[PDB]
Amino acid sequence: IVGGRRARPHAWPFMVSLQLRGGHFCGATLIAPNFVMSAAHCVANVNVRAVRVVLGAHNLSRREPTRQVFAVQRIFENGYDPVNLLNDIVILQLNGSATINANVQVAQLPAQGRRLGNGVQCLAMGWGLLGRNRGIASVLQELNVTVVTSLCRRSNVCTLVRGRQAGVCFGDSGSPLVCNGLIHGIASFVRGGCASGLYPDAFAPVAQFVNWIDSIIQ
Amino acid sequence: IIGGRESRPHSRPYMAYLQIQSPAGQSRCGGFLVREDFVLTAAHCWGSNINVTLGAHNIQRRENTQQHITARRAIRHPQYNQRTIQNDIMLLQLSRRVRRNRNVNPVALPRAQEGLRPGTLCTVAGWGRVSMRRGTDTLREVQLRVQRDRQCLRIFGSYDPRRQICVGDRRERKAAFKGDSGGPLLCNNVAHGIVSYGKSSGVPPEVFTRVSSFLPWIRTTMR
Amino acid sequence: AKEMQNVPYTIAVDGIMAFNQSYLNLPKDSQLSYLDLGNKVKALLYDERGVTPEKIRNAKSAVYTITWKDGSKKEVDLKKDSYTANLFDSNSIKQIDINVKTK
Ligand SMILES: *[C@@H]1O[C@H](CO)[C@@H](O[C@@H]2O[C@H](CO)[C@@H](O)[C@H](O)[C@H]2NC(C)=O)[C@H](O)[C@H]1NC(C)=O
Numbered sequence A: 001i002v003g004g005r006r007a008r009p010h011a012w013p014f015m016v017s018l019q020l021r022g023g024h025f026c027g028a029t030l031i032a033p034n035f036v037m038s039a040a041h042c043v044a045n046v047n048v049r050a051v052r053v054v055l056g057a058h059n060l061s062r063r064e065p066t067r068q069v070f071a072v073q074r075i076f077e078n079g080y081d082p083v084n085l086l087n088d089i090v091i092l093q094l095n096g097s098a099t100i101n102a103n104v105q106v107a108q109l110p111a112q113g114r115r116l117g118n119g120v121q122c123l124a125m126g127w128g129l130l131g132r133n134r135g136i137a138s139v140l141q142e143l144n145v146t147v148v149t150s151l152c153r154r155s156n157v158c159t160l161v162r163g164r165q166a167g168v169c170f171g172d173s174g175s176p177l178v179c180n181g182l183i184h185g186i187a188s189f190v191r192g193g194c195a196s197g198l199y200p201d202a203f204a205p206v207a208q209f210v211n212w213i214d215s216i217i218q
Numbered sequence B: 001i002i003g004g005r006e007s008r009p010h011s012r013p014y015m016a017y018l019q020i021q022s023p024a025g026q027s028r029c030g031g032f033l034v035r036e037d038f039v040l041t042a043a044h045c046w047g048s049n050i051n052v053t054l055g056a057h058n059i060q061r062r063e064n065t066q067q068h069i070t071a072r073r074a075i076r077h078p079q080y081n082q083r084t085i086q087n088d089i090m091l092l093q094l095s096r097r098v099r100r101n102r103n104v105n106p107v108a109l110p111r112a113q114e115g116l117r118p119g120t121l122c123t124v125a126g127w128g129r130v131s132m133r134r135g136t137d138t139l140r141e142v143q144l145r146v147q148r149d150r151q152c153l154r155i156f157g158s159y160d161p162r163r164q165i166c167v168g169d170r171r172e173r174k175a176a177f178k179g180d181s182g183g184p185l186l187c188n189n190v191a192h193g194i195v196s197y198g199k200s201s202g203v204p205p206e207v208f209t210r211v212s213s214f215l216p217w218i219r220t221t222m223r
Numbered sequence C: 001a002k003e004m005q006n007v008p009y010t011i012a013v014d015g016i017m018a019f020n021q022s023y024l025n026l027p028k029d030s031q032l033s034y035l036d037l038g039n040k041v042k043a044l045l046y047d048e049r050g051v052t053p054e055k056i057r058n059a060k061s062a063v064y065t066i067t068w069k070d071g072s073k074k075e076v077d078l079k080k081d082s083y084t085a086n087l088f089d090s091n092s093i094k095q096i097d098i099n100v101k102t103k
Helices: A206-217 B211-222 C034-049 C053-058
Strands: A015-020 A023-032 A035-038 A052-055 A068-077 A090-094 A121-126 A141-148 A157-160 A176-179 A182-191 A201-205 B015-022 B025-035 B038-041 B049-054 B067-076 B090-094 B121-126 B140-145 B164-167 B184-187 B190-198 B206-210 C004-013 C021-027 C061-068 C073-077 C082-084 C093-101
Touching: A015 A035, A023 A182, A023 A206, A035 A206, A090 A206, A121 A182, A157 A182, A182 A206, A201 A206, B015 B038, B025 B190, B025 B211, B025 C004, B038 B190, B038 B211, B049 B090, B090 B211, B121 B190, B164 B190, B190 B211, B206 B211, C004 C034, C021 C034, C034 C053, C034 C061, C034 C073, C034 C082, C034 C093
Parallel strands: C004 C093
Antiparallel strands: A015 A023, A015 A052, A023 A035, A035 A090, A052 A068, A068 A090, A121 A141, A121 A176, A141 A157, A157 A201, A176 A182, A182 A201, A182 C082, B015 B025, B015 B049, B025 B038, B025 C021, B038 B090, B049 B067, B067 B090, B121 B140, B121 B184, B164 B206, B184 B190, B190 B206, C004 C021, C061 C073, C061 C093
């Protein structure tokens, strides 16, 4: 996250880190004790079976026994087209279920159909790059965003931190966009680069996949 | 080299193996010794630091016939055109004169504006890849025919017969390929061409720099 | 990451490919973005074949294809300013093949 703020320790217990060879490549969302949800492009060119799902993390630079760690059994996707970046979402089944507690809690999703519009105030979050070549963030970051309906395409939820140069960045892909308590978004792509203050960040519309989501986690 | 044969060890003692290093990456090319202190090669093989190995057959082995010398100067033709790969010729002034022997000795250059008739059999040699999937540790070579210029002019829109040679039969799987750049086209024991470019597929024909068109610049640069 | 990965690459422009054998350095054991790698590809296009940003803009087509270690391939359209917001490991790239057609 660029221009963001450190999240309060374990502020969002539905947040997830996807690691590989010890590397946070993407964020994700505990949607069910046994299911996380991320962006489809986050796993389309990697070996899933190496990926590790880390729950209850705050400062990735530190060992935190609080953390739960899992491995992916199966992926479920719904037509991610990379050429035009449509349907950038995946749900992943873990090698078990998580102990829901002070540091690990299942998120909550919007209703199928619900859409949201210009001016909503949402929060983004993630461990992506911090932006001033500060590098990747070890402590989870969060950022106040406003839903914009502008250059935004018909098929995405787009956001802007209007008034300053801030936004999502690389490694924030897959992380949730929470609006009025509900995970409405999955980070999918940026335009030109991070924190342009010119182009909104494009999120996959969680509310457009609610149907399929339930069909897999019940 | 695609569709060729392993060279007889040290049968082509002018061959130079080039390892080029720059901050952003590396390259490997061929070249050929033209005087005890100069190697001729392709200008697109230029880079920040150039190591030259003479006298080699297996470049993966530290053979005792090898002489390792760095390029003290790497002189790209002043009108080298990177966009179209024209004037693709470079001289390397070596850091020390090579010790001439059976395994290391220069190759003759052609006479001024010397031409090459279509159908002429030439040999090309190098350490380049032999297919998309495989390379070679040892020197290989293949025999190729000079073509009528029209064979290249339609495929390669920037081909110039005054400065380049069209080589290779389109229906054959015999050609120079990746890593062979800068190596000589040998016709009747004279270096008429320099391996320059072709198709990503490696299918012929392919383009060579015409050495005879640059002899004044060559001579001037070496003295 | 002081040591660098040496990733083979090829450049073809207008049906012409130079016959050197070339490699691009990436920091070893590093993570990179599609913005970083795309910019490296653009720098290489310019410094090896003089291909400018304006030329990529007016080209009929301008892409590069990453072959990953898993065997998967991703094709990147250099004419586009859209970047997926993820990170990937430099050690996972086996080959890059760059192709520009101004036809
Ligand atoms: C940025 O987002 C946070 C989180 O939603 C906001 O803090 C919330 O403040 C609202 C009041 O607007 C309250 O409903 C919640 O109690 C707060 N949530 C949490 C998790 O503390 C913050 O006010 C937002 N700022 C802006 C400018 O929108």
